[PDB]
Amino acid sequence: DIIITTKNGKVRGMNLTVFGGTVTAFLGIPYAQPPLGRLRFKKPQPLTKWSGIWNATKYANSCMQNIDTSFPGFHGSEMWNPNTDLSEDCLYLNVWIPAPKPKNATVMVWIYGGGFQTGTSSLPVYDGKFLARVERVIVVSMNYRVGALGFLALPGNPEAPGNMGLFDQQLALKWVQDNIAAFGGDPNRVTLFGESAGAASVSLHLLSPGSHPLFTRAILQSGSANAPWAVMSPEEARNRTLNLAKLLGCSRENETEIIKCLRNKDPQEILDNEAFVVPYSTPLSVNFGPTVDGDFLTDMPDTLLELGQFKKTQILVGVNKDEGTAFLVYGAPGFSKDNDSIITRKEFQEGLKVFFPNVSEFGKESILFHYTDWEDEDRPENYRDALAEVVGDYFFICPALEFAKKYAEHGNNAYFYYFEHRSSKLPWPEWMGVMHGYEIEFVFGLPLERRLNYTKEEEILSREIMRRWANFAKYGNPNETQNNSTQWPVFKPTEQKYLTLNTESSRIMTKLRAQHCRFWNSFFPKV
Template sequence: MNIFFLPVIITIKIMMMKLFQITFVVFIFCQSILADDQAPIVDTKNGKIRGYTTTLQYNDVKLFVYEGIPYGKPPVGERRFLPSEPIDKWDGIYNAHGYRNACMHSMLIVPDNEIPETKHQSEDCLFLSVYRPAKKTDEKLPVMYWIHGGGFETGTIFSIAYDPSYLAGVGNVIVVAVNYRLAAFGFLYADDEDAPGNAGLYDQLLGLKWTRDNIEQFGGDPDQITIFGESAGSMSVSSHLLSPLTKGLFKRAIMQSGTVNSWMGSNSKTESLKKTKMLANALHCSTDDVKQMLKCMRNASAEAIVESNKYGRNVGLVLTPVHDSEYIPKNPIEAVKNGEFHREIELLFGVNRNEGTVFAAAIFPKLLSPTIKNPQFTRMHAQTLIELLFGIFKISDPKAVAEFYLKNVSDSDVDGLRGAVGAAFGDYHLTCPSIFFGETFAKHSDSNNVFGYHLVHKPSMSGLLECVGYMGVCHADDLVFLFGFPIELRGTVYSEEDYYLSLDMINAWSNFARYGQPGKFAGMEWQPTLPTKSSNSSARVLQIDVRGKQQMIDNHFVPVCENFWRQRIFV
């Protein structure tokens, strides 16, 4: 991983915070939380839990929320860098009400007491939250297990950005959201039993086991669990699909804009160990002996590790999942191509139309920011930026990448030229790896319940505040609809088209969690991504748009993904 990726994550996180600063006042005004109205006490295998009731603006739907339930022992001291262990039983009643700690993440993102998310970071952060409709039912509700994104560096479930209340309430499902360790705490690898790597994935696994063992007490069906995530969360979902450790723990999966078989999604052991030693050097820990190196790193304060990890960004220190490991046994590209994944799982996968524009603009803001007035941006600028990026990504022919993305763009089309830089970035990192994963999964799947989507409608306000103008339908815009912001803010921030698309997406995602098929999307039947097992066609996907404009499209990704990128990144 590289210097350029982390500033992107940080910039995007900050942009998300700006958005939610604006919407928070409206959101809280609309959403009434009845703090004094307690939810029923639930008796789990670890002990009793008391939650609270919240009422949504939409049809006065009520939810029971159990917030910040501990599922793992604090991974501190000797447990730092190790796979997580189940939490011990407790006496009395645990009060699951209110934000808990975020996991340690980038200190460049400093809470300013205006952001509606937890202000506290700690290594003691292994919590999850459960959201369920309060309406009585004899049905065991399907369960959706949410894994947040943030580049494996940032993010927390204790944030308005990832509030799944509308998904649970409108979709009539139970949503479980999990905190997991990030950055060095979650993904440091030392080729040693004391730091085997993938601690963050082991956290997600432990939370998933907790869900399987306890969700029935909340009214959920442990045999109807769907794991879903976006960006790094989606990369995590795909990792679980490849891992032998997750066999039998979930029935369905939803991948939104990211996969493990990508430059961002995972690293080799060699590259991961190199990064660990870079971090050790920044902490003034000798790397001559691994055991002594790890002892030194465990003795360092959490704050010192975060500070050193920030320093390491300048030389490309971004820690991600490691493959050829216990958790991800093979190189993901080879595993996917060979069908070495949980073939019995039903899958929904997809991407947004302009995945890369926010990343490119965050890397080169002085050239690509959409707020620049009368930008002086030429074909030579675009070509230089693309060749620079793909030289860094170690693509053998960066000049060919630039020529491909610029061949149909007029010299006078400044936004088209800037958009081409973003398109190259997004197709390489997110779009094409996701399409390759979904297509190949469908070809090997035991069922035909594999469905793809392509989101092409831009919300009135993006999930990233600075996603405006030429930037299009940006990375994370799907979450605006899935988490119901246009429903909560109907007529104030979001249009009627946004409102209905949000309802349609929530219904499709919850239908998939319930039946293994998303069913009709605004009246249109969502067809499987491959019409037959023997099909050699590219992914058939639903083009998600406003009502009346959505359509099934065939071979949309062939010119870019199949004809250009496959030979470069999926061979």
């Protein structure tokens, strides 16, 4: 029982006990032909019918990816590792439906992050049964190919055209348009939300005309398509295809001859070589990711945003307080999760070489000067704080603000937030602060489960974030307009208002990081 008839066949789900209520979950529904052998590196193929009833009571396979092993046994880094079998057969999606079955329900579609090299929708931190139970929305989750298997690019070649992972997400959005009405949802009321590389993916759908009728609104959590790490140039993506082929002995005279050889190698052989296709690899380097392929993306996001060519709708964008601290541990000299990581002035200068290898020896002296105007000249952690703000401002915070500013410049309602609560359950040290990716547990309502022992102020904060996230998806406004709560105002290009999120109280502020953002936007391009 619990049978829903899709356009490709019947599926069977489960009923889950969630907070004294029931939520219907369909885990592991296929939405594309398995990209195997002949179909590796190609765009996803639409499914045909299946006979019988597909039993969707199980989290499906995770896409082929390397696993973070920098800290064995550490929950802070292994919580982002896949919790299902790794396989190329991984194009599946999940649906959570509130019980009893709703009618014309708002849909929220999650796109996970992972630097376009890792990630899966089955992580317990992405479980949408809490959102479906508390906010009565339908939550859809999806797995898309990462690494070379999802973004190996030979522009113009249909055997490996690039942006395959973005086409995986797009076909899952096509499945929602065709089938979500059978589950009780409104295909004209779908909101995309995602984090990190998932937020860049969400904003890339705003810039892809083919995805425009597949969703209504968008939520960008700590990421945007115009971030420096998001979209690489087509010739840079092409050079990484050859380098991978050269590493695997697949260098050939002909383009398809390269693909034919790569299709014969084991998926692990490809995974074991993606790290060596970039000359100088920064901890924020995307080995294989989105590019300008001429199909999903016809130009660089900065060019498309300037021309105003994007989906005209409302958006919700925001960042965390300490966005860059997580990446300082993974390769910046002098940093560690096992001590306070007080670094010298020269260690700061080596850190900027780690993150900015192509910047002139002059240019890093410019970054040094703009970030050493110490409030207290004798705070020992002055340089450790500065390098974290350098990574946070350039790679995440400032690009997120420019994306919201450009949407407001074209008459679209944007809502900016600033998440500044360090989780009591955060496994990383206290000096790393409100880290990259640790607002997701609050977005999905994990503090509401009392067995995980979050504070009562965290359950209140999570409940308000879910209410603001779901209200924006339902109505385009993340506010409860009458109960005399704090009203989240519209982010304007002028006043630049934004809302804080913490256990204390939500406050209205203006021009977030406006000073340091002016450096990256008006002086850094001039080297």
